[PDB]
Write a protein that binds this ligand. Structure first.
Ligand SMILES: Nc1ncnc2c1ncn2[C@@H]1O[C@H](COP(=O)(O)OP(=O)(O)OP(=O)(O)O)[C@@H](O)[C@H]1O
Lengths: 663, 591
DNA sequence: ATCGATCGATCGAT
DNA sequence: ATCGATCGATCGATTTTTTTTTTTTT
């Protein structure tokens, strides 16, 4: 009626713009014929569903409707303001301009499109002997449509919609708007197919029923609306036919603020967004992206009279996504810069943590666990690690925590952790109530998350018992055991293990004997193959030279020089598993020799006897590992020949792990 | 409409025509609004008005706005927007007015309010707490009827609408408007306002003797939204809204939820600030002197004897220490943190009160403390509309500000582990239920602790005397032990100033420092390095035979310390001359 | 806000 | 014409809800 709900004029009109839409639709120049022709048949070809659109090309054809007239009102200035009218009406012209066949449907291919022709086979035959309802254009689509906005070099044309923004930068006037913001993903609760229109079937009168559903809910129809059952005493029964009704894949995510955008006060703002179509599964939780999409509110249900006023509360929809930080063939050559350089075991050893000065010998062993291997298979079976567990003992911090910052970063499956920090419940699959979608789904991590990869660790003395026993079992490795609740499972943890821990308070006392200084259990240290004692005595010469490096930065961003060229991880990492494919086989020559030095070590460590320097007893596990060491060391040489120097090279690192306690 | 409305509008012609100063100010808005239109192919419509002119204009219209603003205001609303049309009508919308005042009656704090003060625009001030977070709110709606076309249109009015009461009209939402065509929701042509609501507690400073403070709510809409963080000191001014039923709405005790709406809510420092020329020139004049800093030191202890070396460290902390963040790498900690320690009656906590005033950000802490301190502690459940909302604790709320800690030694170590995350990492990490985030807390911090046992803080070794092992020691850049040792020569000095107690300017200092903060960072100069390299190394070469701990982190402070004095000198560049200052206080740090 | 039952009338049957 | 059942317009009732300060045990 007039008055209430008044009809209101706006200077903007798409009536001829829809024609101007089809002027732009199909026909086009810049990219034989226009890009929109065979590409729209490309969807008619059914090798594509998602329809991708950008604001970039609209400007040129708008320039093409411009320069180059006749002059026409701009679409794009009417887009970012609404653009939801463009997600349909601009798109609704596609049935008019789309080719009929355009090729063979075959059989499969797929279902649906074989049924949808049957639905239209049933729909057209309804009117065949009938002599007039038809399937709405929205009822049969089968293809998604997307928009990617212009930043851009077009904005400096000069020409806005693409300017990255904070959640804090989100105005209320941006509702309805196709917009773009940078943000960190969060949640990313699982996607599920959602129907636009139920298909009920009358049975008795048959036909087909299509009722639209919007947002979260709908009110389902009943009885029979079919006209054959209309005005007849008998109304047919109907319920939803899921094979018939169309579905849409629906994902969603919260988007956190980058935290540099944030004000000094307040709080990071999570932003709810909902993923749909081919755009689904395009994101993971915690990833940083410039998000581009239209922003619309989805009230209400309710409540209702509760809200009031309405106070929309809205949400954002995802139009498009731009993510931040997205053989043994020819990459062997990318290995070959340092292959021709040689010194794989050193230059790469020097390649480790170029940021921290000295302790390259410590870094020297770092290269081994970063590689490790190679395990064994006894066929019993019992598999043996296979993995290096390294500990670092010294205080104060020395910036030891920094070594883990570099190592895990480079390392695949790199996981940095600390005593508290992740608990043993954090290293196990632990039941927790899932917000929104329910319920009580288990989420594991840490050890379970770090399996088949290195785990860096700090506050290792403060991990207490609950962690110690777990990692005590994590030293049994290849397992994580939970008898808790109804959960009886034991899950494989392939985790590589390294934790640096601080000596007994306040710092280590040279008078203090070994193992009295350490805060860790002996059985906990016995399954350790290596520990590097970090005790720091001031050396005026060394203090300057290191201070000099501490002078050298902040002075500049580039540390390494006079002289060296640390390998970048990507090219460096590629040699890792490339070397890990080797699996060196032991030569018996070095084989028995390692046995020889063992009974020597089984002798000398025991002849140390009571207290003092220690540690005994030189158990076979270390030899079991020391053998694996040359097996890990051989991998850097590859060649799987296991040299004796390659063997003895580890034995050199064995005594060095200790004996610095004299310093 | 009554001419009473049309006349009041008509009554607003000559004003603000006189004083006409606002006339072009809105035009100043018009231009800048046009300015942005020039570059892109930001200013709020609402304008400030000193109420005072009404006293030279209409005293009846004056107090009436104080009386029934609900009436006088809406016509004043039109003429502004109306003249706004006439001001620029060429090119092809609340336009609110603030009124700093020109107060007041109507001057009251939230603790003392109404019933008479209700339904009247009034200044009320205090803490911003707890400041409900913002949500979007629509007013206008629009639609398209296919296939007949045209365009639909719809309007909305809530309870908090405008100012005065109006008939409530929840519409559901416009659809299938006759003829019965499907109506698709249309946006951005339709109107929106993000909504905000916050309470405000009355000041504990002005709080009465034995009673608790009562925070009272106010709505925040459009620009009014997010103008301020929670916990801020600000004076809100607007009419007090009594809307909502007394239980009579449904036939079947307490009643009438109420709050003030609008208007100005001027932020208040008790930062900001104005500077001008004459003032900053004093800074420019004082900056030349290298003799100023000790004056900067002496001004710190109006009631306090000496410890000027302890004082010097304080201002150097005010500087911020020149944060430099690695490119695609982790930042080293910029700001300095310290802890006062020593025998009882040190006046260390007393000093924090000095740290507590001119500092301007931030909150202090006495022992416990928690749960969580700056932890949000997961404000929950929901609150509101089922929405989980974290509310940052002090440690987060204090970001880019000072942290003072009393009884730091008594505090539970549970949150101490977080203070490692609080200090070394210098950022907040949160997973509880819950929201999963890591948010920056870079806040500058200081604490205080007693000797572990008795008066032996002198005799017994400083280790075991720390009372809070271990890495806690590494964290603080300076720890000063306060000896309670007494001297008759000392006490003689101690008396008269304590005597004069009962019977260079300070405020100029914080203005001198605040501007000294953004201008200008000294960066780094190798010349300062040349002496200090032999210094710190030699420090590890000697002190380790004397005391500890000694770490490169202590050396890292040297860059912080010298960084600060370079600010104290207002030097565009670092100088080795500053190091001797830092090293000396570091000499005093050891001795 | 919609669904639910009461209850009112009316048009057919006996 | 008495009685009924039948449909509809009448009437009115039902729509959120668990986390941070605790405390007896060695
Ligand atoms: N430098 C000083 N100048 C003036 N008065 C001082 C000074 N040092 C100590 N005092 C006196 O000692 C008393 C200190 O009491 P206060 O409560 O401030 O101690 P505090 O800082 O809490 O120390 P603690 O934490 O050991 O209790 C005050 O009465 C103060 O006058």
């Amino acid at each position: 009626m007039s008055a209430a709900l008044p009809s209101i004029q706006l200077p903007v009109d798409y009536n001829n713009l829809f024609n101007e839409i089809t002027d732009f639709l199909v026909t086009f120049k810049q990219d034989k014929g226009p890009k929109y022709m065979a590409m729209l048949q490309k969807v008619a070809n059914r090798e594509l569903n998602s329809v991708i659109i950008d604001l970039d090309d609209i400007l040129q054809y708008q320039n093409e409707k411009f320069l180059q007239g006749t002059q026409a009102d701009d679409l794009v200035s009417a887009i970012q303001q609404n653009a939801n009218h463009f997600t349909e009406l601009f798109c609704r012209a596609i049935d008019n301009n789309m080719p009929l066949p355009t090729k063979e449907i075959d059989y499969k291919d797929d279902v649906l499109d074989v049924i949808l022709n049957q639905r239209r086979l049933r729909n057209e035959r309804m009117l065949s002997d009938r002599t007039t309802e038809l399937f709405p254009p929205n009822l049969t689509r089968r293809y998604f449509l997307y928009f990617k906005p212009l930043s851009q070099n077009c904005a400096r044309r000069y020409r806005i919609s693409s300017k990255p923004l904070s959640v804090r930068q989100i105005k209320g006037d941006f509702l309805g708007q196709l917009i773009t913001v940078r943000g960190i993903i969060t949640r990313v609760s699982d996607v599920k197919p959602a129907v636009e229109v139920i298909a009920y079937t009358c049975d008795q009168c048959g036909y087909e029923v299509f009722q639209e559903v919007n947002s979260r809910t709908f009110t389902p129809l009943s009885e029979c609306t079919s006209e054959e059952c209309s005005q007849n005493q008998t109304k047919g029964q109907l319920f939803m036919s899921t094979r018939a009704s169309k579905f849409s894949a629906f994902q969603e995510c919260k988007i956190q603020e980058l935290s540099q955008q944030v004000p000094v006060g307040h709080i990071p703002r999570s932003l709810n967004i909902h993923v749909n179509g081919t755009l689904v599964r395009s994101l993971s939780p915690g990833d940083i992206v410039d998000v581009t999409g239209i922003f619309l509110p989805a009230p209400y249900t309710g409540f209702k009279a509760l809200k009031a006023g309405l106070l929309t509360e809205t949400y954002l929809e995802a139009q498009f996504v731009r993510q931040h930080k997205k053989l043994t063939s020819d990459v062997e050559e990318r290995v070959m810069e340092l292959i021709t350089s040689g010194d794989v075991y050193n230059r790469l050893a020097k390649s480790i943590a170029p940021e921290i000065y000295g302790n390259l010998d410590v870094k020297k062993a770092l290269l081994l666990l970063l590689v490790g291997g190679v395990d064994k298979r006894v066929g019993d079976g019992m598999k043996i690690r296979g993995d290096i567990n390294v500990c670092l003992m010294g205080d104060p911090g020395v910036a030891k925590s920094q070594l883990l910052k570099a190592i895990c970063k480079i390392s695949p499956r790199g996981v940095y952790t600390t005593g508290k920090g992740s608990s043993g419940v954090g290293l196990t699959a632990a039941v927790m109530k899932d917000p929104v979608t329910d319920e009580m789904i288990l989420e594991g991590g840490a050890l379970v998350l770090a399996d088949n990869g290195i785990c860096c660790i700090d506050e290792f003395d403060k991990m207490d018992e609950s962690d110690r026993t777990a990692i005590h079992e994590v030293m049994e490795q290849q397992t994580i055991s939970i008898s808790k609740a109804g959960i009886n499972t034991t899950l494989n943890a392939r985790t590589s293990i390294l934790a640096a821990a601080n000596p007994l308070y306040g710092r280590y006392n040279p008078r203090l004997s070994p193992l009295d200084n350490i805060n860790l259990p002996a059985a906990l240290l016995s399954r350790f193959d290596i520990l590097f004692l970090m005790l720091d005595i001031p050396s005026r010469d060394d203090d300057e030279k290191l201070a000099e490096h501490v002078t050298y930065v902040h002075m500049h961003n580039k540390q390494p020089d006079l002289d060296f060229t640390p390998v970048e991880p990507s090219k460096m990492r590629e040699y890792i598993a490339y070397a890990k494919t080797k699996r060196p086989v032991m030569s018996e020559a070095v084989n028995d020799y390692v046995v020889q030095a063992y009974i020597r070590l089984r002798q000398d460590s025991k002849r140390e006897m009571d207290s003092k320097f220690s540690f005994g007893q030189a158990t076979p596990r270390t030899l079991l590992g020391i053998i694996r060491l040359s097996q890990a060391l051989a991998k850097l040489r590859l060649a799987d020949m296991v040299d004796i120097d390659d063997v003895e090279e580890a034995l050199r690192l064995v005594r060095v792990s200790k004996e610095s306690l004299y310093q | 409409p009554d001419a009473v409305f049309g006349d009041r509008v008509r009554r607003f012609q000559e004003f603000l025509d006189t004083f006409t100063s606002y006339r072009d100010s809105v035009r100043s808005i018009q231009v800048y609004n046009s300015n942005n239109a020039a570059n892109y192919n930001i200013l709020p419509h609402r304008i400030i008005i000193s109420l005072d002119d009404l006293r030279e204009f209409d005293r009846s219209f004056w107090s009436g706005i104080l009386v029934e603003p609900a009436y006088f205001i809406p016509p004043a609303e039109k003429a502004l927007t109306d003249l706004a049309d006439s001001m620029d009508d060429v090119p092809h919308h609340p336009w609110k007015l603030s009124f700093k005042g020109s107060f007041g009656a109507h001057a009251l704090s939230p603790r003392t309010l109404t019933a008479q003060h209700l339904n009247k625009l009034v200044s009320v001030e205090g803490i911003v707490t707890k400041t409900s977070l913002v949500r979007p709110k629509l007013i206008r709606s629009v639609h398209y009827a296919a296939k007949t076309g045209r365009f639909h249109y719809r309007d909305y009015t809530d309870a908090t609408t405008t100012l005065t009461t109006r008939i409530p009209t929840p519409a559901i939402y416009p659809t299938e408007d006759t003829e019965g065509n499907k109506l698709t929701t249309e946006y951005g042509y339709s109107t929106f306002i993000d909504h905000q609501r916050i309470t405000v507690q009355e000041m504990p400073e002005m709080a009465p003797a034995g009673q608790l403070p009562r925070s009272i709510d106010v709505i925040l809409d459009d620009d009014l939204v997010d103008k301020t963080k929670p916990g801020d000191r600000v004076n809100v001014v607007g009419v007090f809204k009594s809307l909502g039923a007394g239980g009579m709405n449904q036939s079947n005790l307490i009643g009438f939820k109420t709050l003030i709406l609008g208007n100005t809510v001027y932020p208040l420092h008790a930062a900001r600030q104005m500077l001008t020329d004459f003032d900053i020139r004093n800074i420019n004049k004082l900056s030349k002197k290298k003799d100023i800093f000790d004056i900067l030191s002496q001004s710190l202890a109006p009631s306090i004897y000496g410890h000027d070396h302890i004082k010097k460290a304080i201002l150097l902390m005010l500087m911020g220490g020149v944060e430099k963040n690695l490119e695609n790498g982790s930042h080293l900690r910029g700001d300095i943190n310290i802890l006062m320690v020593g025998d009882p009656s040190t006046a260390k906590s007393q000093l924090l009160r000095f740290v507590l005033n001119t500092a301007s950000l931030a909150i202090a802490t006495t022992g416990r403390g928690s749960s969580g301190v700056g932890l949000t502690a997961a404000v929950t459940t929901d609150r509101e509309t089922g929405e989980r909302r974290l509310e940052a604790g002090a440690m987060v709320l204090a970001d880019r500000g000072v942290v003072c800690i009393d009884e730091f030694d008594k505090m539970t170590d549970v949150d101490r582990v977080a203070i490692h995350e609080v200090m070394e990492q210098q950022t907040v990490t949160i997973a509880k239920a819950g929201i999963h985030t890591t948010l920056n807390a870079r806040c500058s911090v200081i604490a205080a602790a007693n000797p572990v046992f008795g008066q032996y803080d002198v005799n017994r070794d400083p280790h075991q005397n720390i009372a809070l092992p271990d890495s806690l020691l590494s964290r603080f850049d300076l720890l000063f032990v306060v000896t309670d040792d007494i001297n008759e020569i000392r006490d003689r000095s101690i008396s008269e100033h304590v005597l004069r107690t009962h019977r260079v300017t300070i405020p100029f200092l914080r203005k001198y420092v605040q501007y000294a903060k953004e201008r200008v960072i000294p960066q780094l100069t190798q010349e300062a390095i040349n002496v200090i390299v032999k210094n710190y190394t030699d420090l590890r070469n000697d002190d380790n035979t004397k005391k500890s701990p000694i770490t490169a982190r202590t050396l890292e402070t040297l860059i912080r310390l010298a960084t600060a004095h370079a600010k104290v000198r207002l030097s565009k560049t670092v100088n080795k001359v500053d190091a001797k200052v830092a090293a000396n206080l570091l000499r005093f740090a050891l001795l």
